[PDB]
Amino acid sequence: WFEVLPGIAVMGVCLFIPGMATARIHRFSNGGKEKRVAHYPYQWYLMERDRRVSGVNRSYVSKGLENID
């Protein structure tokens, strides 16, 4: 009954990687931010706009209130 417990802790740990990996990529690719999702064409229009006015070329950075004062 004991020996099956190392059997569980191999294949089950082998699924822990990609959920950890992907959540440490898109978080890493946007600098500690989640990825902006786009499901409707009105939602994409913000990212199509805001990338052109972010600072140079990025959608994961913001301007804030202090931009135009």
């Binding site: 990825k35 902006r36 999702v37 786009a38 064409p41 994409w44 990212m47 199509e48 706009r49």
Partner: protein, 71 residues
Amino acid sequence: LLQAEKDRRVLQMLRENLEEEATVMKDVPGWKVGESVFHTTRWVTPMMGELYGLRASEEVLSATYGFIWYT
């Protein structure tokens, strides 16, 4: 607000696609600049070829294919 922030853009966008079109060639078999293809002098909505000319390097793909085939 953003409606007023979009129509302002295309009046700018059509101008530099027209002002840089008037200065191309003043040919005797050339176009009268400012003509219309239609007869009815009204405001038709412009076409994707009229916003962006034959430039077509990245940014034109960045406009039409923006929502399409991913976020």
